[PDB]
């Protein structure tokens, strides 16, 4: 065989009776999943993988953009000098897993090494028809509802250069985040509750791993440097509403090693109607939030980081929560796959 | 077709601020990081920082950490760098380069802007005093010229006979005096036999002060 | 923090011959090193990136070699266009440039024509007096100029200026300007500049009486 590029088709367990927007998209775009998927273990086969040069990421991006451009129409769409005022209906939003498959003549290679960084040779390789179910969860800073590392925490960088664009941290233990907009003055005020005991323990393990990659040096976290609110805050979509969460307390250096740092971390969040589209062409204004108790429980399965360059790194290495490039979100799931032609 | 055009030359007093801009074209603006690099007189190129015009994240150098700020206008495809509390040693040419990158790594520069001259001194705009460098009697031919002294700021252009005389003309780069005012000089070698017959006039223009002075040089 | 040292600061190459420039790194930059051409009063032009890969448009006479901490840029046959400044950039950790290397046109030794200029009467009425010593069309660029006022060596009261290497004859020109007040200028008789150069068997002194 040999490496190649081709058109992939998607698979899902969508429902035809669902008004849910991902289900509506998947019933039109994807086929029913294979009840009995077959994978073939190729004994004694070494294969090179590169998550940073994987076109599967390119295709998924097109699909997720198409999904949002078809089903998330705002009232006011502000692109250029054009002010489009259209009808904005409140929708049913909840991402469902999507499988990406190869057509006849092509097969997906799967790297099964438990400690694979995403770029290099893989000794335990299998061939599959489709990838696992991936939820198209669009988020910044924190990767939500994704997959976990099977063994150790993994630091993902292309590392052609110490000047990396994005550093993907793949967690091996999920940390629950409980974002809520309570039923009872302001209806834009929301908050995400996070267990400090678990989070600070995980974050401490993350610094421990970053030391292995950066000369065993002191790891310092810091608030984001510049940019629109979509990247200076935890940006994500919950039930159709756009949330912006101040994560300054999530990266509390003092809580990384011993006082009352455990207990519940309450992140201040707000729902904004005027947003910068991630697609992303111009701004868009949406309808005011729905009445009730808007709630989203998510699994933090990854972190997106930026290492400060041009600094004096004699004893310190400074990292800031990153993201914005939604392609990175797909790479954190597609890293172990690549398409080859028979 | 890729092109970067920076704003015009700026002149500021010490303790003041300044905003340089750079407008991109010929490519997808949000796909390339934009770096600001400066070059102080008699010093190498130094990177001040970059900005990813997409969202847009910024990373500054430690030496400029609290004095500079980079923004972008995605609609106009323009990158701004505001530099605050200017000092004398901030006097430099400020270039603008786009950064070639892979999907997860930042690499080299390829396209550059023409560069922006930024001058910082306590001196005010002064017009040039043009003095003649009169010849006398060497080795067949003699040399004459013009001393353009005490002007601010840069630049100043010098030609001869309104551009008619070019051969043998040597214009020197300006020298910054202890006063804070620049000073250059232009010279030209001519036959000493055709010296008392032909006419020689250096023409000087100082656009920053609306100055246009033509001085005639002749023997004493 | 990564320092790039280019050697030599100035390289003299006669047209058509081969030019080799060096760039040393204080720390390993792997293969993330690029070369740039820079003409006077102009933005740097990308030549070679990734140590040995020419940018689209760069002629085949350019080539980069070496890996780790020692790098070299080669120009097989020097053209008129090639005589400029060449910078090396590392982009392994942050971005740092070298001081640069000027590739001048090598030619035979040329002695300078030395001229001296008394201050104009126009300037004398202002209140200051400038004496200008001109060193015309010489090579190499290295030269020494000393002002002597009544056989007394001067210092910290003059400023020099050099032209770029001329296109036609590949020579340099130097201007030394002595600056005194009209009071100091009229307190002395003999003004002279002494020039030391390779083309002169012994230092040449041009003077005038006020
Ligand atoms: C691997 O290769 C060896 C010899 O190259 C062969 O004997 C063996 O069957 C192969 N598979 C395993 C699982 O060792
Ligand atoms: C290799 O991959 C398979 C799945 O493809 C997995 O079950 C197994 O644990 C991995 N490691 C070894 C040593 O077989
Ligand atoms: C979150 O993780 C838990 C295990 O900690 C798992 O049971 C649950 O299904 C996960 N939820 C999602 C949406 O991934
Ligand atoms: C996750 O990986 C870290 C090492 O990075 C290890 O200390 C920890 O025990 C792992 N957790 C689990 C549940 O495997
Ligand atoms: C990933 O790990 C392998 C293990 O040998 C290594 O060869 C490769 O350089 C690593 N890739 C990156 C980008 O660090
Ligand atoms: C999330 O928070 C809300 C109120 O803040 C609470 O009612 C709910 O029980 C929480 N969910 C979990 C899983 O703790
Ligand atoms: C990149 O690789 C080098 C050596 O290959 C290693 O020293 C460095 O820690 C790596 N960086 C990251 C972020 O993995
Ligand atoms: C890492 O650094 C700590 C001090 O910060 C030191 O005590 C320890 O021995 C180092 N370990 C390694 C493997 O470099
Ligand atoms: C988050 O809150 C802190 C105070 O707790 C504030 O200093 C910071 O500016 C906030 N974040 C943003 C992006 O404004
Ligand atoms: C970190 O936590 C301490 C208490 O544990 C608190 O006083 C401090 O303000 C926190 N830092 C932040 C939120 O940046
Ligand atoms: C929080 O956990 C740390 C872990 O070392 C412990 O020292 C501290 O006492 C805990 N705080 C409590 C139990 O209130
Ligand atoms: C937070 O997580 C820890 C994990 O050990 C658990 O014991 C605790 O009950 C949780 N809730 C808190 C501290 O309110
Ligand atoms: C993650 O999944 C849970 C259950 O599937 C859902 O309630 C939650 O909204 C999801 N989070 C995001 C950000 O989609
Ligand atoms: C970097 O900062 C540390 C902080 O203690 C200092 O010791 C070191 O000298 C600095 N590096 C320099 C000045 O090059």
Query: How remote is the CA of residue A176 from the centroid of ligand 4, in Å?
Result: 17
Q: Is A249 in the pocket of ligand 5 (CB under 6 A)?
A: no
Separation of CA A321 from chain center = 13
Residues B43 and B138 in one domain: no
Q: Which experimental method was this entry solved with? A: X-ray
Contacts of C1 in chain A (CB under 8 A): 312-313
Cα–Cα distances in Å, from C208 out to B2, B144, B174, C191?
58, 16, 26, 6
Helix, strand, coil share (%) of chain B residues, nearest 5: 5, 55, 40
Please state, in angstroms and rounded to a whole number, the distance separating the CA atoms of residues C154 and C144. Answer: 13
Rg, chain A, Cα only: 21
Residues B13 and B117 in one domain: yes
| Edge-to-edge strand list for the sheet holding B78-83 | B3-6, B18-25, B78-83, B68-73
Residues B4 and B108 in one domain: yes
Q: How long a stretch of residues is chain C?
A: 210
Residues B116 and B16 in one domain: yes
Q: Return the closest-CA partner of residue A203 out of A137, A278, A265, A253.
A: A253
Cα–Cα distances in Å, from A329 out to A98, A140, B184, C57?
14, 9, 59, 37
Give the residue before each break in chain A, using a C-to-N cut-off of over 2.5 angstroms; say none if it is continuous.
Answer: 184, 257
Please state, in angstroms and rounded to a whole number, the distance separating the CA atoms of residues C164 and C200. Answer: 22
Please state, in angstroms and rounded to a whole number, the distance separating the CA atoms of residues C153 and B104. Answer: 63
Taking the CA atoms of B23, B27, B31 and B37 in sequence, report the sign of the dihedral they define. negative
Residues B111 and B154 in one domain: no
Q: Return the closest-CA partner of residue C164 out of C8, C43, C39, C11.
A: C39
Residues B53 and B127 in one domain: no
Please state, in angstroms and rounded to a whole number, the distance separating the CA atoms of residues A241 and A224. Answer: 23
B120 burial via Cβ count (<10 Å: 0-12, 13-18, 19+): buried
Residues B88 and B178 in one domain: no
Residues B63 and B161 in one domain: no
Please state, in angstroms and rounded to a whole number, the distance separating the CA atoms of residues A144 and A174. Answer: 9
Tokens 């999507």 belong to A98
Q: Does C93 touch chain A (CB under 8 A)?
A: yes
Total domains in chain A come to: 1
Last residue of a domain, one of B106, B122, B138: B122
Contacts of A226 in chain B (CB under 8 A): 51, 56-58, 70
Q: Does C96 touch chain A (CB under 8 A)?
A: no
Residue nearest to atom 9 of ligand 6 (CA): A178
The answer to whether C185 and C119 are in contact (CB under 8 A) is: yes
Total domains in chain B come to: 2
Q: Which residues, in sequence order, are bridge partners of residue C114?
A: C135
Cα–Cα distances in Å, from B125 out to A84, B11, B153, B174, C148?
51, 9, 6, 16, 34
Domain with B188, as residue range(s), is 123-220
Q: Return the closest-CA partner of residue A291 out of A90, A86, A117.
A: A90
**Would you list the DSSP string of A116-157?**
--SEEEESSEEEESB---B----BSSEEES----SSS-EEE-
CATH number for the domain spanning A300: value is 2.170.40.20
A231: enclosing H helix or E strand: helix A229-232
Encoded tokens for A227: 């940019």
| Residue A272: count of CB within 10 angstroms of its CB | 18
**Would you list the DSSP string of A169-206?**
EEEEEEEEEEEEE-----SSEEEEEEEHHHHHHHHHHH
The answer to whether B88 and B121 are in contact (CB under 8 A) is: yes
Residues B3 and B38 in one domain: yes
Atom of ligand 4 at shortest range from CA of A172: 1
The answer to whether C43 and C99 are in contact (CB under 8 A) is: no
| Residue A200: count of CB within 10 angstroms of its CB | 22
DSSP code for B163: G
Encoded tokens for A138: 């669009």
Q: Does C92 touch chain A (CB under 8 A)?
A: yes
A66: enclosing H helix or E strand: helix A56-71
Q: Return the closest-CA partner of residue A48 out of A101, A113, A99, A102.
A: A113
Residues B139 and B112 in one domain: no
Encoded tokens for A20: 């849910």
Query: How remote is the CA of residue A190 from the centroid of ligand 6, in Å?
Result: 12
| Residue A162: count of CB within 10 angstroms of its CB | 20
Q: How long a stretch of residues is chain A?
A: 342
Q: Is A141 in the pocket of ligand 9 (CB under 6 A)?
A: no
Report the interhelical angle of A327-334 vs A56-71 (nearest 10°). 130
Taking the CA atoms of C56, B79, B107 and A232 in sequence, report the sign of the dihedral they define. negative
The alpha carbon of residue A162 is apart from the nearest alpha carbon of chain B, in Å, by 8
Q: Return the closest-CA partner of residue A98 out of A137, A124, A65.
A: A137
Helix, strand, coil share (%) of chain A residues, nearest 5: 20, 35, 45
Residue nearest to atom 14 of ligand 6 (CA): A178
| Residue B13: count of CB within 10 angstroms of its CB | 11
Q: Pick the ligand that lies closest to the CA of residue A133.
A: 3
Quick one: resolution in A? 2.9
C36 burial via Cβ count (<10 Å: 0-12, 13-18, 19+): buried
Q: Is A153 in the pocket of ligand 4 (CB under 6 A)?
A: yes
Q: Chain A interface, mutation test: which of B104, B106, B108, most A Cβ atoms within 10 Å? A: B104
**A222 three-class SS:** coil
Contacts of C30 in chain A (CB under 8 A): 161
Phi and psi angles of residue C202, each rounded to the nearest 5 degrees, phi first: -145, 155
Cβ–Cβ gap A53/B103 under 8 Å: yes
The answer to whether A129 and A340 are in contact (CB under 8 A) is: no
The answer to whether C143 and C191 are in contact (CB under 8 A) is: no
What are the structural domains, with CATH classification, of chain C? 1-107 (2.60.40.10), 108-210 (2.60.40.10)
Please state, in angstroms and rounded to a whole number, the distance separating the CA atoms of residues A153 and A11. Answer: 29
The answer to whether C149 and C189 are in contact (CB under 8 A) is: no
Q: Chain B interface, mutation test: which of A53, A83, A162, A163, most B Cβ atoms within 10 Å? A: A163
The answer to whether B161 and B120 are in contact (CB under 8 A) is: no
Q: Chain C interface, mutation test: which of A160, A161, A165, most C Cβ atoms within 10 Å? A: A161
- Return contacts of C39-43, CB within 8 angstroms, 24+ apart: C39/C84, C39/C85, C40/C84, C40/C85, C40/C164, C42/B114, C43/B95, C43/B112, C43/B113, C43/B114, C43/B115
Taking the CA atoms of A285, A287, A292 and A298 in sequence, report the sign of the dihedral they define. negative
Residues B139 and B115 in one domain: no
* DSSP E strand stretches across chain C: 4-7, 10-13, 19-25, 33-38, 45-49, 53-54, 62-65, 70-75, 85-90, 96-97, 101-105, 113-117, 128-138, 144-149, 158-162, 172-181, 190-196, 204-209
The answer to whether B117 and B200 are in contact (CB under 8 A) is: no
Q: Return the closest-CA partner of residue A150 out of A131, A132, A130, A170.
A: A170
Cα–Cα distances in Å, from C106 out to C10, C12, C99, C169?
11, 5, 21, 11
Domain with A264, as residue range(s), is 1-342
Residues B42 and B52 in one domain: yes
Please state, in angstroms and rounded to a whole number, the distance separating the CA atoms of residues A197 and A125. Answer: 37
Residue nearest to atom 14 of ligand 7 (CA): A213
CATH number for the domain spanning B152: value is 2.60.40.10
Encoded tokens for B79: 């990158």
> Which among B100, B134, B139 has the least Cβ separation from residue C120?
B134
Rg, chain C, Cα only: 22
Give the chain C residue whose CA is nearest to the CA of B5. Answer: C43
Last residue of a domain, one of B122, B147, B176: B122
């Amino acid at each position: 065989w040999k490496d190649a590029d081709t058109t992939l088709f998607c698979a899902s367990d969508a429902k035809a009776h669902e008004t849910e927007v991902h289900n509506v998209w998947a019933t039109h775009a994807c086929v029913p999943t294979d009840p009995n998927p077959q994978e073939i273990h190729l004994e004694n086969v070494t294969e090179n993988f590169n998550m940073w040069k994987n076109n599967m990421v390119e295709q998924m991006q097109e699909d997720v953009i198409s999904l949002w451009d078809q089903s998330l129409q705002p009232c006011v769409k502000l692109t250029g000098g054009s002010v489009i005022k259209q009808a904005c209906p409140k929708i049913s939003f909840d991402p469902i897993p999507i499988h990406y498959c190869t057509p006849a003549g092509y097969v997906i290679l799967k790297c099964n090494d438990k400690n694979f960084n995403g770029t290099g040779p893989c000794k335990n390789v299998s061939s599959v028809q489709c990838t696992h179910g991936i939820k198209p969860v669009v988020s910044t800073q924190l990767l939500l509802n994704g997959s976990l590392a099977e063994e150790e925490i993994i630091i993902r960088s292309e590392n052609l250069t110490n000047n990396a664009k994005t550093i993907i941290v793949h967690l091996n233990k999920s940390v629950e985040i409980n974002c809520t907009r309570p039923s009872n003055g302001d209806i834009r005020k929301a908050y995400c509750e996070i267990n400090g005991t678990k989070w600070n323990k995980v974050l401490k393990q993350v610094t421990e791993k970053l030391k292995e990659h950066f000369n065993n040096k002191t790891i310092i976290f810091q608030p984001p440097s510049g940019g629109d609110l979509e990247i200076t805050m935890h940006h994500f979509n919950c039930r159709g509403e756009f949330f912006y969460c101040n994560t300054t307390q999530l990266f509390n250096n003092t809580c990384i090693g011993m006082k009352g740092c455990n207990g519940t971390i309450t992140l201040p969040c707000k729902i904004k109607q005027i947003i910068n589209m991630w697609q992303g062409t111009g701004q868009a204004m949406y309808a005011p939030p729905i009445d009730g108790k808007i709630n989203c429980v998510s699994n933090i399965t990854g972190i997106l980081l930026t290492r400060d360059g041009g600094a004096n790194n004699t004893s310190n290495e400074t990292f800031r929560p990153g993201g914005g490039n939604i392609k990175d979100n797909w790479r954190s799931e597609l890293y172990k796959y690549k398409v080859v032609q028979i | 077709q890729v092109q970067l055009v920076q704003s015009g030359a700026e002149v500021k007093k010490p303790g003041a601020s300044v905003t340089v801009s750079c407008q991109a074209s010929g490519y997808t603006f949000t796909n390339y990081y934009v770096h600001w690099v400066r070059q102080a007189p008699g010093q190498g190129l130094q990177l001040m920082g970059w900005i990813d015009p997409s969202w847009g994240r910024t990373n500054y150098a430690q030496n400029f950490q609290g004095r500079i700020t980079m923004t972008r206008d995605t609609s106009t495809s323009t990158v701004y760098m505001e530099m605050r509390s200017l000092r004398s040693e901030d006097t430099a040419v400020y270039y603008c380069a786009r950064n070639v990158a892979t999907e997860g790594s930042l690499l080299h520069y390829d396209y550059w802007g023409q560069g922006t001259l930024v001058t910082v001194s306590a001196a005010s705009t002064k017009g040039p005093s043009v003095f003649p460098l009169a010849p006398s009697s060497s080795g067949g031919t003699a040399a004459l010229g013009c001393l353009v002294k005490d002007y601010f700021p840069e630049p100043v252009t010098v030609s001869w006979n309104s551009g008619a005389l070019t051969s043998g003309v040597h214009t020197f780069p300006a020298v910054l005096q202890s006063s804070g005012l620049y000073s250059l000089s232009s010279v030209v070698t001519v036959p000493s036999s055709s010296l008392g017959t032909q006419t020689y006039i250096c023409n000087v223009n100082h656009k920053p002060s609306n100055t246009k002075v033509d001085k005639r040089v002749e023997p004493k | 923090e990564i320092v790039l040292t280019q050697s030599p600061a100035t390289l003299s190459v006669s047209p058509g011959e081969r030019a080799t420039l060096s760039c040393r790194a204080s720390q390993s930059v792997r293969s993330n090193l690029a070369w740039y051409q820079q003409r006077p009063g102009q933005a740097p032009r990308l030549l070679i990136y990734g140590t040995s890969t020419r940018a689209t448009g760069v002629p085949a006479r350019f080539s980069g070699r070496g890996s780790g901490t020692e790098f070299t840029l080669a120009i097989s046959s020097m053209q008129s266009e090639d005589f400029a400044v060449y910078l090396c950039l590392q982009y392994n950790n942050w971005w740092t440039f070298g001081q640069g290397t000027k590739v001048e046109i090598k030619r035979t030794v040329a002695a300078p024509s030395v001229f001296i200029f008394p201050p104009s009467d126009e300037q004398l009425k202002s209140g200051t007096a400038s004496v200008v010593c001109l060193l015309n069309n010489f090579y190499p660029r290295e030269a020494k100029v000393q002002w002597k006022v009544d056989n007394a060596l001067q210092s910290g009261n003059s400023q020099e200026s050099v032209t770029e290497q001329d296109s036609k004859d590949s020579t340099y020109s130097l201007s030394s300007t002595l600056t005194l007040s009209k009071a100091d200028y009229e307190k002395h008789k003999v003004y002279a500049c002494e020039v030391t150069h390779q083309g002169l068997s012994s230092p040449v002194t041009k003077s005038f009486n006020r």
